[PDB]
């Protein structure tokens, strides 16, 4: 499978999540995603084929994970935007007020702005600290998906938000949306990963 930010993958033939970013760890290929998407060793599938398993994760507390893929996967420095792509150029962290977009299997490609940093989400499982808040909308299934600037700087992976009864926060005004992502920097250093760029 071609690994692109934003595409769907399933975990143990049950839940669905979205790919974050293609990364490498020495010769091993992988992608970063959300911790709440699977437990260590869960099996990730892309279009019905096995692509890898969860190598590590932290959830709750943080919300992060990396899946190590088999050798046959093709890692790409891109994030889906409809039929087009956003090239990943790096991981400079943008500041409050910067515009940002996110890509995921449920709501596609949505943009908005970063409204706050260091936010805590109280999930049923426990608190998740240090999240950055943006107002791009997100829906159930978007978790783990890419958060990136139009200029190609990777910001993080989708964690959660105030989804309404329709499964998303796209039907409420930007001013009332709280869509949270986990910062990419600490995931890259914690696992010793390098981003695939182009």
């Amino acid at each position: 499978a071609n690994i692109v930010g934003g595409i769907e993958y399933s975990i143990n033939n049950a839940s669905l999540c979205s790919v974050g970013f293609s990364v490498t760890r020495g010769a091993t290929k992988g992608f970063v995603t959300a911790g709440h998407c699977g437990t260590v060793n869960a099996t990730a599938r892309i279009g019905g084929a096995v692509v890898g398993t969860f190598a590590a994760r932290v959830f709750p507390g943080n919300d992060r994970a990396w899946v190590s893929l088999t050798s046959a996967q093709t890692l790409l420095p891109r994030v889906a935007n409809g039929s087009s792509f956003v090239t990943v150029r790096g991981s400079t962290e943008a500041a409050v007020g910067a515009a940002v977009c996110r890509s995921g299997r449920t709501t596609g490609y949505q943009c908005g702005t970063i409204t706050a940093k260091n936010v805590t989400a109280n999930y049923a499982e426990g608190a998740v600290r240090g999240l950055t808040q943006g107002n791009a909308c997100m829906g159930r299934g978007d978790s783990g998906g890419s958060w990136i600037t139009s200029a190609g700087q990777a910001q993080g992976v989708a964690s959660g938000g105030n989804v309404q009864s329709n499964g998303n926060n796209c039907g409420i005004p930007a001013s009332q949306r709280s869509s949270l992502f986990e910062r990419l920097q600490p995931i890259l250093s914690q696992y010793g990963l390098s981003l695939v760029t182009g």
Partner: peptide
Amino acid sequence: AAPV
């Protein structure tokens, strides 16, 4: 908020 909820996870996703």
